[PDB]
Amino acid sequence: TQETVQRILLEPYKYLLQLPGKQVRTKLSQAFNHWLKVPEDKLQIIIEVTEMLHNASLLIDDIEDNSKLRRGFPVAHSIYGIPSVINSANYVYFLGLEKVLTLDHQDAVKLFTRQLLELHQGQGLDIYWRDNYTCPTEEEYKAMVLQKTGGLFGLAVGLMQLFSDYKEDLKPLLNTLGLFFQIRDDYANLHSKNKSFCEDLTEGKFSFPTIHAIWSRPESTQVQNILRQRTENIDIKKDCVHYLEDVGSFEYTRNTLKELEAKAYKQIDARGGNPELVALVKHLSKMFK
């Protein structure tokens, strides 16, 4: 009956849509429309595509990170099982490709193909580093973030620019915003004090503050011992936070974010200014200010 089969195939995806989300990709797309001025018919398809693909990748991320909860609620594969979530999220990917084909543009699929290939390289490296106990350098981590986060950012803005007269190069600004967002999340996860606490330590992932501490003081192995343990001991995680403070990694992260915030303002002005985008950067910058 087709409508029946699509219903059971989208069930894990529909569960995730009800969970609390931030929709930052929507808020960044609307800010970039200040320049691009994309007609509303194409713009809605673009936004649906982007959030479709972003929501499907969250389903996959939670499996790949062994997450237990998502925003306070049980994770999707805890309820529907790993096999259903994989097939559902993967099915959504190709529903997104099907929707991209409705934009009626020869370059749209090429963009889709490139950006999804970028996101899988980013996510793959991040997984590989964690699963093979290989701590990346700061440069390597930044290069990976540009792919993992720049993937969907670049898909949205790139597709918009296909239907815009504004042809200026927005890729440097997008790279700054990709780093800014990811490192700000790394900082919040650890520098924060019901609510989850340092779940990146429990997930054993190398984040920006832990990477700095590892290479800053290689004589010590404290952070490695905690990440390898992949434990949920609150006290062990608290001791990791105390270490990153004395080593000065939280300050290093704040200075990195402040420098990124300043580059974003300089890059936004070069592109002609964008009060919506500027206001958004400032509001997110208070966290480390």
* Chain length of the chain: 289
Binding residue per annotation — 25?
yes
Judged by CB under 8 A, the residue of 58, 63, 284, 287 near a copy of itself is 63
- Give the separation between CA 72 and CA 153, rounded to whole angstroms: 26
| 207 contributes a contact to a copy of itself by CB under 8 A | no
Q: How far apart are the first and last CA of the chain?
A: 56
- Angle CA 201–87–151, to nearest 5: 55
Binding residue per annotation — 182?
yes
Binding residue per annotation — 271?
no
Closest CA to 55 of 3, 95, 83, 82: 95
Strand residue runs (E) in the chain: 69-70, 73-74
HSE on the CB side for 101, CA within 13 Å?
Answer: 6
Compare residues 41 and 98 and give the one whose CB is closer to a copy of itself: 98
Q: Nearest distance from residue 280's CB to a copy of itself, in Å?
A: 30
Stretches 1-9, 44-52, 154-162, 210-218: which one binds a copy of itself (CB under 8 A)?
A: 1-9
Q: What's the DSSP call for residue 103?
A: G
Compare residues 91 and 166 and give the one whose CB is closer to a copy of itself: 91
Q: Nearest distance from residue 127's CB to a copy of itself, in Å?
A: 5
Q: Which of residues 176-205 bind a copy of itself (CB under 8 A)?
A: none
Stretches 6-14, 35-43, 241-249, 272-280: which one binds a copy of itself (CB under 8 A)?
A: 6-14
| 97 contributes a contact to a copy of itself by CB under 8 A | yes
Closest CA to 92 of 58, 139, 43, 131: 58
| 14 contributes a contact to a copy of itself by CB under 8 A | no
Compare residues 138 and 140 and give the one whose CB is closer to a copy of itself: 140
Listing DSSP states for 110-160 in one string gives: HHHHHHHHHHHHHHHHHHHHHHTT-PPPHHHHHHHHHHHTHHHHHHHHHHH
| 52 contributes a contact to a copy of itself by CB under 8 A | no
Compare residues 68 and 120 and give the one whose CB is closer to a copy of itself: 120
- Give the separation between CA 170 and CA 154, rounded to whole angstroms: 9
CB distance 46 to 160 below 8 Å: yes
Residues placed in the known binding site for dimethylallyl diphosphate = 70, 148-149, 182, 195, 205
Residues placed in the known binding site = 22, 25, 54, 61, 65, 70-71, 148-149, 182, 195, 205
Give the footprint of a copy of itself on this chain (CB under 8 A): 4-9, 60, 63-65, 80-84, 86-88, 90-91, 93-95, 97-98, 101, 109-110, 113, 116-117, 120-121, 123-125, 127-128, 130-131, 229
